A paper describes a structure:
AaRSs catalyze the attachment of the correct amino acid to its cognate tRNA which then is used in protein synthesis on ribosomes. Phylogenetically phenylalanyl-tRNA synthetase (PheRS), belongs to the class II aaRSs, and it is a dimer of heterodimers (αβ)2, containing two α- (PheS) and two β- (PheT) subunits. Structural studies of PheRS have shown that the α subunit binds L-Phe and ATP and is responsible for esterification catalysis. At the same time, the β subunit is involved in the recognition of the cognate tRNA molecule and editing of mis-charged tRNA.
The protein-fragment interactions were analyzed using crystal structures for five of those fragments complexed with MtPheRS/tRNAPhe (DDD00107555 (D-555), DDD01008876 (D-876), DDD00805735 (D-735), DDD00079004 (D-004) and DDD00067116 (D-116)). All five fragments occupy the L-Phe site in the α subunit of the heterotetramer. The bicyclic quinoline, quinazoline and benzimidazole moieties of the fragments are completely enclosed in the L-Phe binding site. PIEDA showed that the phenyl ring or the bicyclic core of the fragments interact with residues αPhe255 and αPhe257 through hydrophobic interaction. Residues αThr258 and αAla305 make hydrophobic interactions with the phenyl core of the fragments D-116, D-004 and D-735. FMO analysis showed a strong hydrogen bond between the proton of NH2 moiety in D-004 and residue αGlu217. Hydrophobic interactions with αAla305 are retained in fragments D-735, D-004 and D-116. However, the auxiliary pocket in the structures of PheRS with bound fragments was completely unoccupied offering an opportunity for fragment growth by adding hydrophobic substituents to explore the auxiliary pocket of MtPheRS.
Residue numbers in the entry:
A (entry chain B): -2 to 831
B (entry chain D): 42 to 141
C (entry chain A): 142 to 341
D (entry chain E): 498 to 831
The structure:
RNA sequence: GGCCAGGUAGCUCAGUCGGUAUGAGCGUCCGCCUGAAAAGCGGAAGGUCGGCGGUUCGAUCCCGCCCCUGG
């Protein structure tokens, strides 16, 4: 879309007009183009060939019958008195055609040495070469046929083809549309090398043709954005004429195939000057030519014979009968030039770049004319390109240039296409670059690119040329001076940054969380934001589940995965399947990333004027139109949690390991969490816990549902955990511990509760009743023997009592233990073990 | 399934009607299996809802409690404050010369 | 993502970048293609001067192969102050490259285009322990903040100037360590993360 | 430039040890009264070469610390004596180690900057002050609970603390049996990075524990962080999309052969096809032989460009068995 | 946008233009074996042949539409 192919010989020729004898190596030229801001994607030299590679003429053709494909035994005239007998499998040539022959002893590109062979019962004293075999073009179907008059038989093939040339593959930035021609690139090289430049579109190089009257009646609708529309006819062209070899070759090296002279002229002038041209068969035009917007439901058939559904924003060229062209994109098949065309009407127009860009993108037609118009084409060279086309086409096709010319330039007619002048201080490029440029550097460089510079004290007044509409502000003028002087002259100075505050509390908490999980045996992954296809259906979620309210992507990489992630688990479970399915069956993955949870249907905010700062009310409006993106931490586990070794066979992953991951994230976040049983897919309803920080729910953890594991192809007993980090308040506790120098009292309490009673609820009740004397409590026994009734369990806690100012007695600790036993009896129905 | 592959050895004029009998038997056993799969799956899903309940509050940390010293933590926080302002951390020996 | 960063409407400077748009069509909501919208968000909220970096996920419609990934991470740089110049941008890029490629890291800036910078440039690097031979490889884009961007945030371009840069973390990790397949950097196989150690 | 590589490493060592169940303490530089006499060190022990304080707070404790262990063991005694019997402490601080008698340097004119020769002469007159990391353990390593009765502290826990420090320092370490007081000669390991000795670890001597009043089975660690070089490795792994081949091999060696030496010999012989090797069985008995042991290793083979046959993996396994035969005298179990 | 070639077991891949993919290598499982393993020998399991429809008594195979990859 932004490519620019051109051979160095053509580029050197245009530069050499103003700088005679200018010549550089392809390596140096690539460095210069890069130094001024032209990305060189490729540098491909032609050939190389060695030995006898000569131009020949097919004087006879014998069809060798009795094979798979048509095999031809050809008598080729290579310039001497002995015709060579060549065997060839191509069928794209006839008797009398000029071809390129590689004789025995030649070496084609690729190290292929040519010699005589015994092919198809006959001898092959060489071969007829194709464009691909000579490293000239991409054509490999048939052999290369030079146009008649390209050379005489016996001429050096490398010279006629110009195989010492080098084609340059450029990637032009969208701000330098003027560089999509030999004219612009040569002008850039003249600036970089401080050369005198002769504009190939100037009136000296393209002298104006006579203007004796209108060429064709034309009506232009001005609100279509057209800035110029010129027409000039060329009558009596020879239908049998073809373009010379130098023209067809330069088109080939630029990536354009030659068809007929009329079209070859327009494509050649487009490459030379940057102004797209089109040739209409004037004998097929019926009545007044009209430039207007397309109507609703209107269609048109282009050069390729494809019907195009047009939009009311598309600009058209029409006559009384049909549409003639999709403005700035492609002409129509009604006025196209074919074999019997004798009178042509050349069209030189300047279209609105936005209108062409919209139309070409809707119709998917990025033609050579479209990509140039959408990047603005110089409107001051329209007649010059028109006259260059007429004179060159009449010269090749043996026609006559009509002295008529229609040139619509707007209402009123515009005779000055200069952008508005720009005022800028003479030292502004020096301040932005931090470089003291020599006296007059700014004014010198700005005149080089073609601008008019006047001096008003210390302030310059710069009027950019018509082919540089990208120069609208002093910053644009600064880039011109800086890039031509070379960015390498800018020194390296560290900025005066002020004292910062460093990482935030949330940024530091994430570091601690990832460090703790990795140190605890977890492996970090990067979760993809695109959800898997139908994952929530595999999870068995309700149709109104909050996780299903997703944001969709219009153009995803995979059409079956457009929705964004409302939870980090599907991405982690997908990475877990990858590891398990490749030999790593004992895995523990974790991820820290944001999720996308819309709060409403997707709504957009209109364009706010950029010319000013948006007020805080509109900022709050743009933020409210965005889905909530909270920070989440999640992890999944499968297989062995503890690896096997000399100690034992290892421990498989269980739900308690997911709960331990919660306690690790809690400890890394300096908060206290409580775990309460909950039912929440895709977890096992009997092995699932809802995590709470105080009274706020922050996530879930435990073992996944066995049906979800089956439907998702996960390993058996896979556990998961997910927490909302933004739901956890950032805490910075300042503890003030006072160590007691007095001994402690150790006691164990055994309580019998129902099986459904959580063990933490028993410890919370024992702690609440014991009082301040309780220093530490730890559960170390859960007994469910036959002495304990059914659906009941015995829990034994290790209590440690210590006073801050005295030594306790056993009755002192037993008093707090009894009060703790009474509290457990009231809160969890505990019974002292008997 | 062995009756399905035995149709390839049958004469062409017989595979039509003999095959029609095979699919009818094939769909008969398949339709009975599909419903039984759903009923047994529904029973499994209903079993985990009323049983298999664990105490999610049981202690899970088998690693003892560890802690860095608060003085080292304060020095760490003081260092991060000055690094964020561009300063660096210098060092010096505890046993010092009287010259220094 | 586009309008506040001087992206022209209906122009190849905006249409060339194929972006993930949020359904329905013409919703003006999209997945970010660069960490550059954080420039706008920072300039409206914070008081001048501003010296911030931003690290986050960015989304492009590129197919995942050995050297490209549709979802990658980028580090954004924004410095807005009184009297900032290209030399201050060059000084920041040199210090950044010296910390991630060693003391033998010397950079090279060449002109380029970005809708939000004028002048714009691309940064190349060169360190001594080059995995693929000592040569110039592309690192990221940079340049001075366009005055239109400063006007769209309420900053006077006559008093305040600023520069910027943006480099991909996924691209930086490749040629620094010599990683062969970028797919292994994102696919999440433990065989890729484990050789790097625990990390802290 | 932020933190130096060493300073960053010291934070990682402190974080990793704390997350693994260790509690940081601040060690006092003044040695307990006759601690080395309680350790039973020889009179020519390099640790006995201490720098003495002229005016100490305690007249019986005037020597400065050549090792961090006496201060950590003293803090370990305080915790156990106050009801905290299951305790794991650690400390990161510098020690002092003179290479000669305390030599002073005369006054240098303050009216000017001393030259670099005078600065180097002032630094040479000071004792060597390298930074050490050390840890002590006693009682239960794993606390009891609903899972089981817990595991007491053993020498392998001290060796694991070394590996925790090594993983934090991004370096590889090798353990070799050594006799070095106050460690138990049969439960002591000398830590090496490359070819540089960096410290010792393991269970303490029973006589040292008895004379110092320490808990039975006390284990300790001490490393010289200045002896460990800083490293910033740049790995570039390539994940092979081809399936792996699992194989196990049992090898019989002498009892004194360390299991790591057999694993290294298997790695050296298996070649680049070996992706992972893990030891999961140590067996002894009359089927094996006296003063011998059988070690079984789980091997994982994988090629980066092809699927392997079982003969492909068995060839690399046989080359590993042959490498262990030449290196540690291993015999394939039959 | 073109006519094509591809999507096949857990991994990497053969193979079929109507009734069995007598699928391979590695992966999983069983037996002999070992204190417990692995190899070896001897054996099983596992694919709804990319998805949705259609044609057909019956579709990996024939038709249509769609998803994903290379030219
Ligand atoms: N994210 C990003 C990419 C390219 C930039 C170019 C110039 C300034 C800032 C940029 N940011
Ligand atoms: Mg510019
Ligand atoms: Mg496959």
């Amino acid at each position: 879309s932004n490519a620019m192919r051109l051979p160095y010989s053509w580029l050197r020729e245009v530069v050499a007009v103003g700088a005679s004898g200018w010549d550089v190596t392809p390596g140096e030229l690539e460095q210069t183009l890069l130094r001024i801001g032209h990305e060189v994607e490729e540098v491909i030299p032609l050939g190389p060939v060695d030995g006898p590679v000569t131009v020949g003429r097919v004087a006879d053709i014998e069809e060798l019958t009795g094979y798979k494909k048509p095999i031809r035994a050809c008598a080729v005239d290579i310039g001497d008195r002995q015709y060579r007998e060549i065997i060839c499998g191509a069928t794209n040539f006839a008797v009398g055609d000029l071809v390129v022959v590689a004789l025995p002893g030649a070496t084609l590109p690729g190290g292929f040495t040519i010699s005589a062979r015994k092919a198809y019962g006959r001898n092959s004293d060489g071969m007829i070469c194709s464009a691909a075999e000579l490293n000239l073009g991409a054509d490999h179907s048939g052999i290369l046929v030079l146009p008649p008059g390209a050379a005489e038989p016996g001429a050096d093939g490398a010279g006629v083809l110009g195989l010492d040339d080098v084609v340059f593959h450029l990637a032009i930035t969208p701000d330098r549309g003027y560089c999509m021609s030999v004219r612009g690139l040569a002008r850039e090289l003249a600036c970089a090398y401080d050369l005198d430049f002769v504009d190939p579109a100037s009136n000296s190089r393209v002298p104006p043709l006579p203007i004796e009257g209108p060429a064709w009646p034309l009506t232009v609708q001005p609100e279509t954005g057209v800035r110029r529309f010129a027409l000039r006819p060329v009558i009596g062209i020879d239908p049998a004429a073809v373009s010379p070899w130098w023209l067809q070759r330069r088109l080939l090296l630029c990536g354009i195939r030659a068809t007929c002279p009329a079209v070859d002229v327009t494509n050649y002038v487009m490459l030379e000057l940057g102004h797209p041209m089109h040739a209409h068969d004037r004998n097929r035009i019926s009545g007044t030519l009209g430039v207007r917007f397309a109507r609703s439901g209107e269609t048109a058939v282009t050069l390729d014979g494809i019907e195009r559904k047009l939009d009311t924003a598309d600009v058209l060229i029409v006559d009384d009968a049909a549409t003639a062209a999709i403005g700035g994109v492609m002409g129509a098949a009604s006025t196209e030039v074919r074999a019997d065309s004798t009178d042509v009407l050349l069209e030189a127009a300047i279209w609105d770049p936005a209108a062409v860009s919209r139309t070409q993108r809707r119709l998917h037609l990025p033609s050579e004319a479209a990509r140039r118009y959408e990047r603005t084409v110089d409107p001051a060279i329209s007649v010059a390109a028109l006259d260059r086309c007429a004179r060159l086409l009449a010269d090749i096709a043996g026609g006559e240039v009509s002295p008529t010319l229609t040139d619509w330039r707007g209402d009123p007619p515009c005779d000055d296409w200069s952008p508005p002048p720009i005022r800028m201080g003479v030292d502004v490029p020096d301040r932005i670059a931090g470089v003291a440029y020599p006296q007059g550097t700014t004014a010198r460089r700005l005149a080089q690119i073609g601008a008019v510079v006047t001096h008003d004290g210390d302030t310059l007044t710069v009027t950019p040329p018509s082919w540089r509409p990208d120069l609208r502000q002093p910053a644009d003028l600064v880039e011109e001076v800086l890039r031509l002087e070379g960015l390498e002259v800018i020194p390296s100075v560290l900025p005066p940054a002020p004292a910062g505050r460093g990482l935030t509390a949330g940024q530091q908490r994430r570091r601690t969380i990832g460090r703790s999980l990795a140190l605890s045996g977890y492996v970090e992954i990067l979760p993809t934001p695109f959800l898997p296809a139908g994952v929530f259906d595999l999870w068995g979620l309700e149709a109104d589940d909050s996780r299903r309210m997703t944001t969709r992507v219009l153009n995803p990489l995979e059409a079956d995965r457009p929705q964004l992630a409302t939870t980090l688990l599907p991405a982690l479970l997908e990475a877990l399947v990858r590891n398990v399915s490749r030999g790593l069956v004992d895995v523990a993955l974790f991820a820290i990333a944001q999720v996308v949870q819309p709060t409403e249907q997707t709504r957009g905010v209109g364009l706010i004027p950029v010319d000013r700062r948006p007020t805080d009310d509109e900022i709050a409006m743009l933020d409210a139109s965005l889905p909530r993106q909270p920070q989440h931490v999640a992890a999944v586990l499968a297989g062995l949690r503890e690896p096997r070794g000399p100690w034992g066979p290892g421990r498989p992953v269980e739900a308690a390991d997911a709960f331990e991951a919660v306690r690790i994230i809690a400890r890394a976040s300096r908060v206290d969490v409580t775990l309460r049983p909950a039912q929440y897919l895709p977890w096992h309803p009997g092995r699932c816990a809802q995590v709470f920080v105080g009274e706020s729910s922050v996530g879930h953890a435990g073992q996944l549902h066995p049906a979800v594991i089956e439907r998702s192809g996960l390993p058996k007993g896979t556990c998961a955990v997910e927490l909302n980090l933004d739901a956890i308040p950032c805490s910075a506790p300042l503890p003030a511990p006072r160590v007691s120098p007095y001994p402690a009292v150790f006691q164990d309490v055994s309580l019998v509760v129902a099986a459904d009673i959580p063990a933490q609820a028993v410890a919370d009740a024992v702690r609440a009743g014991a009082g301040d004397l309780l220093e530490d409590i730890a559960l170390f026994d859960v007994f469910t023997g036959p002495q304990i009734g059914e659906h009941r369990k015995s829990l034994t806690f290790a209590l440690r009592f210590r006073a801050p100012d005295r030594t306790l007695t056993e009755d002192d600790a037993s008093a707090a233990r009894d009060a703790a036993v009474q509290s457990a009896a009231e809160r969890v129905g505990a019974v002292l073990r008997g | 399934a062995l009756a399905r592959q035995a149709l390839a050895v049958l004469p062409k004029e017989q595979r039509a009607e003999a095959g029609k009998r095979v699919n009818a038997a094939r769909n008969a056993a398949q339709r009975s299996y599909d419903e039984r799969l759903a009923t047994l799956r529904a029973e499994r899903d209903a079993a985990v809802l009323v049983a298999e309940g664990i105490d999610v509050t049981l202690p899970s940390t088998r690693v003892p409690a560890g802690a860095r010293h608060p003085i080292i933590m304060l020095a760490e926080h003081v260092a991060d404050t000055f690094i964020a302002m561009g300063w660096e951390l210098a060092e010096g020996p505890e046993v010092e010369t009287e010259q220094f | 993502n586009f309008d506040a960063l001087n992206f022209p409407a209906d122009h190849p400077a905006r249409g060339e970048q194929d972006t993930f748009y949020i359904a329905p069509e013409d919703s003006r909501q999209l997945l970010r293609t660069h960490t550059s919208p954080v420039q706008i968000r920072t300039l409206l909220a914070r008081e001048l001067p501003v010296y911030i970096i931003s690290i986050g996920r960015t989304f492009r419609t590129d197919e995942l192969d050995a050297t490209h990934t549709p979802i990658f991470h980028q580090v954004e740089g924004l410095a807005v102050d009184r009297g900032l110049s290209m030399a201050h941008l060059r000084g920041t890029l040199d210090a950044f490259a010296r910390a991630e490629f060693g003391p033998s890291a010397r950079t090279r800036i060449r002109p380029h285009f970005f809708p939000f910078t004028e002048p714009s440039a691309e940064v190349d690097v060169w360190f001594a322990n080059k995995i693929g031979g000592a040569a110039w490889v592309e690192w990221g884009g940079c340049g001075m903040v366009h005055p239109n961007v400063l006007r769209a945030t309420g900053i006077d371009p006559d008093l305040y100037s600023g520069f910027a840069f943006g480099m991909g973390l996924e691209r930086t990790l490749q040629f620094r360590n010599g990683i062969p397949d970028m797919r292994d950097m994102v696919e999440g196989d433990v065989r890729f993360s484990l050789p790097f150690g625990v990390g802290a």
